[PDB]
Amino acid sequence: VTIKDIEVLNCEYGKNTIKFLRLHREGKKHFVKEVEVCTHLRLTSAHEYLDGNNSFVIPTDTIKNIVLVLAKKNGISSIEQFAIDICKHFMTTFCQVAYVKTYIQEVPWQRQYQNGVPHIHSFILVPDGIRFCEAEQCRNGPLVVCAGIKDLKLMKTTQSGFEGFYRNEHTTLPERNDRILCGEFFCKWSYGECRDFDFDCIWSKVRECILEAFSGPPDCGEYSPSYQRTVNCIQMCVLSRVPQVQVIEVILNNNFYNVVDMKALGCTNDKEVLVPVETPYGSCACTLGRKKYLEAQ
Amino acid sequence: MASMSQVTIKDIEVLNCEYGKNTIKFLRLHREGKKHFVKEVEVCTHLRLTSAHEYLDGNNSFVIPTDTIKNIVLVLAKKNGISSIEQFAIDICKHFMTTFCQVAYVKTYIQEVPWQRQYQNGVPHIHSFILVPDGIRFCEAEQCRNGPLVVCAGIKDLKLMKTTQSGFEGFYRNEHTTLPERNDRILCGEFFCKWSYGECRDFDFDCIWSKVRECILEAFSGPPDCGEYSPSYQRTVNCIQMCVLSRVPQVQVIEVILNNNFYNVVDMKALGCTNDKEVLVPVETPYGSCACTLGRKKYLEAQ
Amino acid sequence: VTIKDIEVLNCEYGKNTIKFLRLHREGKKHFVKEVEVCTHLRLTSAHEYLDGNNSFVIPTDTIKNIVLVLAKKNGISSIEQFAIDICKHFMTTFCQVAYVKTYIQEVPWQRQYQNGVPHIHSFILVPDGIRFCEAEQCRNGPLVVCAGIKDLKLMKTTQSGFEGFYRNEHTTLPERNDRILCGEFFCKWSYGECRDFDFDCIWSKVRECILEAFSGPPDCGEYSPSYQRTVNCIQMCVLSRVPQVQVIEVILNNNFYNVVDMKALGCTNDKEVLVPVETPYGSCACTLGRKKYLEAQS
Amino acid sequence: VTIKDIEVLNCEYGKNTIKFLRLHREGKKHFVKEVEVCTHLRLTSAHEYLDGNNSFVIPTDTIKNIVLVLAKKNGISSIEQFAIDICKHFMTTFCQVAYVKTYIQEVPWQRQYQNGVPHIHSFILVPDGIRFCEAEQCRNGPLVVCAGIKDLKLMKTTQSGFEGFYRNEHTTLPERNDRILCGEFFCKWSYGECRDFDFDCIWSKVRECILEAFSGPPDCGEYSPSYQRTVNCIQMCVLSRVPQVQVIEVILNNNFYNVVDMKALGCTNDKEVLVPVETPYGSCACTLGRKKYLEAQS
Numbered sequence A: 001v002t003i004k005d006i007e008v009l010n011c012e013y014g015k016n017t018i019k020f021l022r023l024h025r026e027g028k029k030h031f032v033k034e035v036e037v038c039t040h041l042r043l044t045s046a047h048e049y050l051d052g053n054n055s056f057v058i059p060t061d062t063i064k065n066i067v068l069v070l071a072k073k074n075g076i077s078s079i080e081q082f083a084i085d086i087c088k089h090f091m092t093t094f095c096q097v098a099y100v101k102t103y104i105q106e107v108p109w110q111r112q113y114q115n116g117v118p119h120i121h122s123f124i125l126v127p128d129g130i131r132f133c134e135a136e137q138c139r140n141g142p143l144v145v146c147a148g149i150k151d152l153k154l155m156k157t158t159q160s161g162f163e164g165f166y167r168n169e170h171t172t173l174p175e176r177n178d179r180i181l182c183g184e185f186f187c188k189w190s191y192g193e194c195r196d197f198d199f200d201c202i203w204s205k206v207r208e209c210i211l212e213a214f215s216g217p218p219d220c221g222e223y224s225p226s227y228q229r230t231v232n233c234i235q236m237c238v239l240s241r242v243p244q245v246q247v248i249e250v251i252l253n254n255n256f257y258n259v260v261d262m263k264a265l266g267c268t269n270d271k272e273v274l275v276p277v278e279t280p281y282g283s284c285a286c287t288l289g290r291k292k293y294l295e296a297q
Numbered sequence B: 001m002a003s004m005s006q007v008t009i010k011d012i013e014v015l016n017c018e019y020g021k022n023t024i025k026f027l028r029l030h031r032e033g034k035k036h037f038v039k040e041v042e043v044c045t046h047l048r049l050t051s052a053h054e055y056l057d058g059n060n061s062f063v064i065p066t067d068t069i070k071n072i073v074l075v076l077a078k079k080n081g082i083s084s085i086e087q088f089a090i091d092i093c094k095h096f097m098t099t100f101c102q103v104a105y106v107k108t109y110i111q112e113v114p115w116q117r118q119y120q121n122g123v124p125h126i127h128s129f130i131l132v133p134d135g136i137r138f139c140e141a142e143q144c145r146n147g148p149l150v151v152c153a154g155i156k157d158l159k160l161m162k163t164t165q166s167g168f169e170g171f172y173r174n175e176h177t178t179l180p181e182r183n184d185r186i187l188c189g190e191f192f193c194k195w196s197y198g199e200c201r202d203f204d205f206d207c208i209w210s211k212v213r214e215c216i217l218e219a220f221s222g223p224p225d226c227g228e229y230s231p232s233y234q235r236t237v238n239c240i241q242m243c244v245l246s247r248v249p250q251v252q253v254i255e256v257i258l259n260n261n262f263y264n265v266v267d268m269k270a271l272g273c274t275n276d277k278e279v280l281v282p283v284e285t286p287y288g289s290c291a292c293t294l295g296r297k298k299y300l301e302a303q
Numbered sequence C, D: 001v002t003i004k005d006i007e008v009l010n011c012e013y014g015k016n017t018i019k020f021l022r023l024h025r026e027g028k029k030h031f032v033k034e035v036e037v038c039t040h041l042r043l044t045s046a047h048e049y050l051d052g053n054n055s056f057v058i059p060t061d062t063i064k065n066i067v068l069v070l071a072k073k074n075g076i077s078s079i080e081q082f083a084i085d086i087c088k089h090f091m092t093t094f095c096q097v098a099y100v101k102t103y104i105q106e107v108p109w110q111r112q113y114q115n116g117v118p119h120i121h122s123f124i125l126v127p128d129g130i131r132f133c134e135a136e137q138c139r140n141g142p143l144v145v146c147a148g149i150k151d152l153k154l155m156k157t158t159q160s161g162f163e164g165f166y167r168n169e170h171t172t173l174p175e176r177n178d179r180i181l182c183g184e185f186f187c188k189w190s191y192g193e194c195r196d197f198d199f200d201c202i203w204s205k206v207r208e209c210i211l212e213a214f215s216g217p218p219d220c221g222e223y224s225p226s227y228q229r230t231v232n233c234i235q236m237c238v239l240s241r242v243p244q245v246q247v248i249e250v251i252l253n254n255n256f257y258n259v260v261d262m263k264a265l266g267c268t269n270d271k272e273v274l275v276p277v278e279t280p281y282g283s284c285a286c287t288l289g290r291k292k293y294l295e296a297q298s
C-alpha cells in the first residue's frame, strides 16, 4: 500500500486552548476580556504527512504568537471581531492556507459590585452560560461568523408535560402534564457575512430571547408540551426579535426530576422531594434558517 | 522482623472507622399559591458506630444501612422542609443521635445547587430559575455522643480577581530564588472559606452567610473607588479573616484557603511589540496556595 | 415571523450515556461487558417541534428500554454487533425513523490474574485507551460500522524532531532534531458494510499497528520529522496490514516537554528535567481512504 | 476585635501540581519517571499574614525551583526517596520552616513491548491505580513516610452480600447473599521512620496484597459479608504480610449494580443486565495501627 492506493479526504492542524487576558485601562477604571482561543488551518498541500517535508507548515507556536500579537495591537472590542481579525490575518498572510477556523470562548468574569457600586478593578467568575463565537473562511469564500452560549442551565418547576407520544411494547413512560423542565442549552446562530452591528448588544438580546421564551411571562409562564416544542419556541422567539440571526441551532440536554415514592417510609410525597436523573439523559437538537438566506446560497 | 505468621485483632488498634452515604441529590419544592420556591442540595451523612464488629468479626448486627441514611435524609426534607441547609444539617445529626445508641458520631455535609429566580424587566418569575455558580454555599454539622453539636458554614469555588493593587516584595532570597520583586500584578484567587459558629444556633443562618460572603468580597477588593494594596496573598487572606471576625460576632473560627494563578505579562520583544501590561497569560499549573485558620482566643480557651 | 418564513435544516434527538453491565456465566467462570450507549434518531416529520404534536415521537425512555432488552436477549459478542443490532431494530420497527446512529464505548474492565492464573469473577479497571464503535443507517441506505480507540496516550523520549518549517516575522520556534513526542490519540476507521469477520480480532490488530508504527522497532526506533508524519505512518501501517479498514481518521493532541533552563539556579540541564505544556496544545488530524472504496461510493 | 483577641491556629502555604519528567539514558535505553509534586511549609512566624512583612517567606516559586534542581542533581530512584530528599532539604536549609510536607504521585507510564522485546524509548499511559507517597517532618520530630494507591477500581461479580444488619422503620434494604461488589479504593499506609528497605519492592507487595485479599483465590474466590469486612480483609492481609506497614487507611467508595426489573418489557432478567448507581454512593473507611507502633510513640 503506497500514496498511489490512498486518497487524503481531510487534513487539519492547529493550536488549542490559547488562554490570555487583555487588560484595558481608562484612567483608574480597568476592563478585562479573558478568552480561550483555538485556531485550526487546512493547508493546500499535505507534504508534511505524505513526504516528511515541513516547508509549508506554519508552526502551531506561530499560530499562538499571531493570536497574542493581534490581541495586543488591536485590543478585543468583541470576541467576534477578534475571530474575524484572526481569520483575515491567516488568509491575507499565507497562500498555503486553504481554510481557517477560529473558536473563542469568554472566561465569564463580572465586575464586583459593593452595595450597587461598580469596583474599578475587581472581578468575580460567574459562569451563567459561556459566551463563544466561531469564524471560518475557505480561500476566496465568505468569512462566516457564528455566536453562541453553551452550558446554560435553565429550570422551571411546572408548565411542562409530555403526552400523546408514540406507544409500543417497549414504552413504559407514563403521560405527564406536570413535571420539572430542567435543560442544559447549547445555542449557536449564524450572522453569515453581516459585520456592521454591535456584536455585544446583539448577543445580549439573543440571550434575553432564550430566557423569556423558555420561561414565558413572569406572572403565569407558558405550557411546554415537550423539550422539542420549547426548543422551537426559543428559536422562533430569537428569529422574530433579532433580524441579524440567519440560522439558529439549539441543543437541549434534559434532566428528569423524579417524585420519589415514600409510601414504604410512611409518608406521601406530593411533588415535595424530587431526585434528578443526570445519567442517562435525553437530548434534542434543531437547526432553523430563514428561507430568504438559504435560497441566496 | 516478626514473631507471628499473621496479625490478629490482639496486635492492632482501630484508630478510626467511618461509613455513610455521599452525594444524596434532591430538590425540595415549596408552593405559596402560584409562586414556587426551590432548594436543591447535595447531602453527605457519615456515622461512626460505638463498635467495629462489621469490620473485625464480619457481624452486621449494629450496622445502619447507608440506604437507611438516604431514606432518613429524604423523609426529614419532606416533613421539615429546608429553611436553611444549616438547620437541615442540625436536624439530621439530632435524628441520628436521639434514635440510634450504636452511633458514637454523626457528620452531615450539605452544599446548595446555586439556582437563582429568573427576572424579566425587574419582575421575579413565579416558577423559572437559572444556575448561577458565583461560589458554592455549604455547611457541616457534627456531634460526638455527649459532646457539643457544632455547625460550620462556608463558600468554595469562589474565583476573585483584581488587576492591580497587588504586589509581593521583600521576601527571603537564596541561590534558588529567581522571582523578581513586583508592586503591580494581577491577584487572582480560588477561595475556600469555612467558619465555625460552635454551638450558637439561634440566628438567621441565611442572613449571616450572606453577611460573611459580603465581608470576603469587600476585604478582597477594598473600596470600589480606589481599592486597597495587597503586599501578599497571605496578607489578603488575613484582611478577609479580620474583616469577617470584626463584623460577624457569630464567627468563632475561620479557615481561608487561597489557590492563586499568576498572570504573566508575555515578553513580545522578538515579535516586534512592547507589551505594557496589555496581554497576560495565566499559569494554572503549578499553582501557589496559602491557608490560615484564625480563632477568637476567648472561644479556644473555653474549650 | 411564522413557519412559512423558516426551513427546518435538521432535527435529531436521543438518549445519552445508557450505562449497563452484561454478565455472562459459564459455570463458575464470569464474563463482563460494561458499556455506555448513545442512540440518536431523525424522524421523517417535525410536528413535535413545529405544532406541539408528539404523535410520532418515540420516547428517549423507550430508546433506553430497547437497548437494555436487546442486550438481555442477544448478549454482547462485540460492541460493533450490538450497535448493528440496535440500528437494525430501529429501522425495521419504526417507519417514522429516517436515520439512526448508535455510539458505544466499553468500560475497560480487565480480568484479575494471580501469577498468570485468571480469576473466575474478579476484575480491575485499566483505561489504556477506550474502545468504541459507531453504527448508522439512513432509510434505504447502507448500514455503516466504524470502530476506534480514543484517550490512548503514547510517548517516546527521542527519534522525534520538527525542522525545515515555514519561517515568518511571528515565528520564534527553534529547529529541533531531538525532543519528546507525546500524543493523546483518537483513531476511528470504517469497515463500510463489511460484517463477516471477528470484530474483536480486527480491533486488536489495528491497536497493535498503531503502537508499532508510533514507536518503530524496539532496538532502534524510527525518526519522526513531525507529529503529522507520525500520524501518516500510523494510517499507512493500519491500511497495509488490515484489509478490512477502508477509511481511517487519526487525531493527535500533543504535549510539548520543555527542557527547563536551570542556568540561573546554578546547574546545566542536559535533557534531564522536562516540564510538559498541557495548554495551549497542538493538534493534527488526517482521514485517508482506499481509492477503490471511495470510487465504489458514486 | 484586634490582633490581641485572635489566635493563629494554623498557617500553611506551598506550590501544588509541579509536573515534570526525569529522563535517564543508559546508552540507547531510556528510563522515565514523570511525577506531580506538592510541597507545603509552615513557618515559625506569621508576619506575612499579621504585619504585611515578607522577610521570612520562601517564595512558592523557590519551592518549585528546589524540587526541579533536586530531581536534576539526585535523579528519582523512588518517589518516596524523592519526597524524603525534598523534606530533608527544607529542614536542613531554612530555620524559618517549622514543618514540611511533600506529596508525590507517579504518571503511570509503562515501557512498550514489540514481539516480547522491551522498547528502548517508547511508553504508553496505563492507569491501573495511581501510585503516591507523602513525607512530612516537624522541627525536632521524626521524618515519617507514607505510600499509597488511589483511583483503584476493583469489581467482583459474585461472592458478595450484606445480611443481618440493623432494621428500623426507615430500613427498606433487602437482605442479599449475591451482588456485584464494585469499589473505588484509596489506600494509604505509614512506614513511620523505617527507611532501610526497597520502596518499589514493598509498594508492589502491598498492591498484590490488596488485589489478592479483595478477590480471594482465582479458582473459587472468598465470600464478603460487607464492604466493611472486605476493607478489613485487605488491611489484615497487608499487616500480616508486610511488617514495614505500621498504620493502614483504606477508603472504599462502592457502586451498587441493580438487576433491572424488565417484567413490563416482557422478559425476565436473571442477573444478566445490571445498571450501576454512581450517585448517591456508599463509602466506608477504616485506619488500623499496630499496638506495638502506637505504644512506642510514648
Ligand SMILES: O=c1[nH]c(=O)c2nn[nH]c2[nH]1
Pocket (backbone or CB within 6 Å): A161, A162, A173, A225, A226, A227, A228, A282, C013, C057, C058, C059, C060, C061
Ligand atoms: O419532552 C420530552 N420529549 C422526548 O422526546 C422524551 N422522551 N422521553 N421523555 C421525553 N420528554
Ligand SMILES: O=c1[nH]c(=O)c2nn[nH]c2[nH]1
Pocket (backbone or CB within 6 Å): B167, B168, B179, B231, B232, B233, B234, B288, D013, D057, D058, D059, D060, D061
Ligand atoms: O503573595 C505572594 N506570596 C507567596 O508566598 C509567593 N510565592 N511566590 N509568589 C508569591 N506571592
Ligand SMILES: O=c1[nH]c(=O)c2nn[nH]c2[nH]1
Pocket (backbone or CB within 6 Å): A013, A057, A058, A059, A060, A061, C161, C162, C173, C225, C226, C227, C228, C282
Ligand atoms: O511536528 C510538529 N508539527 C507542527 O505542526 C508543529 N508546530 N509547532 N511544533 C510542531 N511540531
Ligand SMILES: O=c1[nH]c(=O)c2nn[nH]c2[nH]1
Pocket (backbone or CB within 6 Å): B019, B063, B064, B065, B066, B067, B068, D161, D162, D173, D225, D226, D227, D228, D282
Ligand atoms: O456492605 C454494605 N455495607 C453497608 O454499610 C451498606 N449499607 N447499605 N448496603 C450496605 N452494604
Ligand SMILES: [Cl-]
Pocket (backbone or CB within 6 Å): C031, C111
Ligand atoms: Cl476473559
Ligand SMILES: [Cl-]
Pocket (backbone or CB within 6 Å): C157, C158, C178, C271, D025
Ligand atoms: Cl536522547
